[PDB]
Amino acid sequence: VKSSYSYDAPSDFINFS
Amino acid sequence: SSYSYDAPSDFINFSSL
Amino acid sequence: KRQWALEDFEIGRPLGKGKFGNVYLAREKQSKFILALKVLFKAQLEKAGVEHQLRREVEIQSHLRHPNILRLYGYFHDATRVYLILEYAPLGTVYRELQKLSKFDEQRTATYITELANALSYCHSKRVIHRDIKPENLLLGSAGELKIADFGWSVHAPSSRRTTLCGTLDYLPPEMIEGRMHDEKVDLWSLGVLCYEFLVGKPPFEANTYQETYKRISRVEFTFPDFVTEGARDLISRLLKHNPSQRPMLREVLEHPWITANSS
Amino acid sequence: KRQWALEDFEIGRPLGKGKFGNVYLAREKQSKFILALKVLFKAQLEKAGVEHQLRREVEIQSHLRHPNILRLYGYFHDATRVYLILEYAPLGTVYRELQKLSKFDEQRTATYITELANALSYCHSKRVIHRDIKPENLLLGSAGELKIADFGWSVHAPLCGTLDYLPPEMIEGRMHDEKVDLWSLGVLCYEFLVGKPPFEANTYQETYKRISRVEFTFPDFVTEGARDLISRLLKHNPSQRPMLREVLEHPWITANSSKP
Ligand SMILES: Nc1ncnc2c1ncn2[C@@H]1O[C@H](COP(=O)(O)OP(=O)(O)CP(=O)(O)O)[C@@H](O)[C@H]1O
Ligand SMILES: Nc1ncnc2c1ncn2[C@@H]1O[C@H](COP(=O)(O)OP(=O)(O)CP(=O)(O)O)[C@@H](O)[C@H]1O
Numbered sequence: 001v002k003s004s005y006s007y008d009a010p011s012d013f014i015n016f017s
Numbered sequence: 018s019s020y021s022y023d024a025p026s027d028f029i030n031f032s033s034l
Numbered sequence: 035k036r037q038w039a040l041e042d043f044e045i046g047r048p049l050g051k052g053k054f055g056n057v058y059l060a061r062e063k064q065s066k067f068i069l070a071l072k073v074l075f076k077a078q079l080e081k082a083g084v085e086h087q088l089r090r091e092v093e094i095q096s097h098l099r100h101p102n103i104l105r106l107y108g109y110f111h112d113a114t115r116v117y118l119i120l121e122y123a124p125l126g127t128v129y130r131e132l133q134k135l136s137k138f139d140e141q142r143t144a145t146y147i148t149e150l151a152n153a154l155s156y157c158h159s160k161r162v163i164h165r166d167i168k169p170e171n172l173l174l175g176s177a178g179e180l181k182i183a184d185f186g187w188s189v190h191a192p193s194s195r196r197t198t199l200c201g202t203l204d205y206l207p208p209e210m211i212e213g214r215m216h217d218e219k220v221d222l223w224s225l226g227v228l229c230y231e232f233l234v235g236k237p238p239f240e241a242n243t244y245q246e247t248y249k250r251i252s253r254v255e256f257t258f259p260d261f262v263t264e265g266a267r268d269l270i271s272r273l274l275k276h277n278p279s280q281r282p283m284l285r286e287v288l289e290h291p292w293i294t295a296n297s298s
Numbered sequence: 299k300r301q302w303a304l305e306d307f308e309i310g311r312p313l314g315k316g317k318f319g320n321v322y323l324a325r326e327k328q329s330k331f332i333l334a335l336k337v338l339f340k341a342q343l344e345k346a347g348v349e350h351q352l353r354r355e356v357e358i359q360s361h362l363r364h365p366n367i368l369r370l371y372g373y374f375h376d377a378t379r380v381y382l383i384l385e386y387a388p389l390g391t392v393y394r395e396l397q398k399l400s401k402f403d404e405q406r407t408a409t410y411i412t413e414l415a416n417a418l419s420y421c422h423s424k425r426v427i428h429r430d431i432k433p434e435n436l437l438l439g440s441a442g443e444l445k446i447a448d449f450g451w452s453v454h455a456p457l458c459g460t461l462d463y464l465p466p467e468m469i470e471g472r473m474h475d476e477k478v479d480l481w482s483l484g485v486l487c488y489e490f491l492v493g494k495p496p497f498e499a500n501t502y503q504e505t506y507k508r509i510s511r512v513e514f515t516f517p518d519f520v521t522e523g524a525r526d527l528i529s530r531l532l533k534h535n536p537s538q539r540p541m542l543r544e545v546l547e548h549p550w551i552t553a554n555s556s557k558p
Contacts (some may be wrong), residue, residue: 003028005340005349005353006021008086009357010372011301011374013301013302013306017329020116022096022109024093024106024109025107026094027038027108028038028042165468203506203509205485211509213471222461251461
């Protein structure tokens, strides 16, 4: 097992404005 | 919220090692 | 296969109830091997803000292999539930045993203490501090042996603990410096308390109120009853020292005379 | 539903080194938004075994919206790198500033302490304890407004029915966990005004010892009122430290802050 790097943190593309 | 843990998720042959 | 699915398991009687779901007996179909399948309700978990606590618990425990530590073989989950695949402990908790026998003779006590100290020496070996150990979290394998099984407050020690502390030192408060010097030694208090509870049948610092218990622990106010021998008094007294540093090491608890003398 | 990718950004010039990779200036190709892109390398995080410290610092920070806290907007990862999308702080660190001015005046310090106290209140209101703050971790936005940037030692806060089995040191120090952030403020206040922290010494051992004994001195130019404040914050027993409201109200702060 290496790490999956799944965090409970946003990963969604964001519109700026 | 995603339930990915850096922990084992794979089937184990229990008859083995 | 690759991944576990609920359909790999026949499922038997409930082994008991937890906060967030129930533990079942269970058998893997293809090898007919007996285990326990712990079931945790995502709804209740997310409503109680313990997802990350759970994550920590499963990660830490899954990487420990020791005869006196409960195996967590794996996890998986479906839309509603998280499932833990654990080694099955046939003979119940130490808590239920303790309260049928009232207290233990010194043979059992020393045996369990040895079993515990081995388990924590290993945890420490692999940079893990177990924290809250009480009888309820101690199960019994087939031959009568202890299995530690909570890790709810278990932490990986930050490694490079001399270098990583040193350098931010000017900025952290006394609490935090002592915290990280001897967090290790917290597991020695626990041995002391438990050893005491095993012989006497109630912890050293029991009281009517949380506030008194708190003052008692704070001042290390306890007394032994008469039937507790010198070797025991000696060991517990050494383990329950106010200042973390004066507590012995696990190496010294294994070597201790009273232990070797009664450990089977 | 649409997810970050590396070719959503124009990778600009570097802003710094850092332990496990680098921070680059960058622009979000569509919106033209200037941000900062922190790149870490998976093979170095695995070798140091610090992935879970990364995960935690990213989980914690990315759920924090506050003018005085660096926004981390998101993250993603390719086969070999991890990328963190951060608010960009032009005017460097409070560490550089403090070297270049030697020390700060009452007006600057009180103002900085006000921004720290507000950011810290917010943090606690989210059951988050920051713990360790150095000036190196304090960046400055483009109005020189102060931005908490590091979270490596931060934890999320929860308790008992189980104290019979707890040692005194977990009993105490814990369940007075807020007051750790008050100590840090006292040390920063002292440091801004005097030039160096109050427990600095030749040896780590001199230093440590001083921290426990709480032995420090005030240079003659430190005003009675700053001393008052600094002294309540640097209390051995966490219980006796004030709350962040008492700091924001403290007359020396309101007397000197360029702004609330
Ligand atoms: N692997 C196992 N083998 C046998 N019995 C088990 C077991 N795991 C749990 N049990 C039984 O089920 C009961 C509840 O399980 P467990 O203690 O793991 O849930 P829980 O952690 O939610 C209770 P707590 O509130 O103390 O944390 C235990 O008291 C124990 O008797
Ligand atoms: N959002 C941001 N905007 C502008 N500059 C930044 C920035 N984040 C970091 N920097 C600059 O680049 C450097 C990289 O610092 P970083 O935050 O990566 O430190 P680090 O925690 O990875 C290792 P250390 O803790 O020893 O500094 C910083 O020292 C700072 O000067």
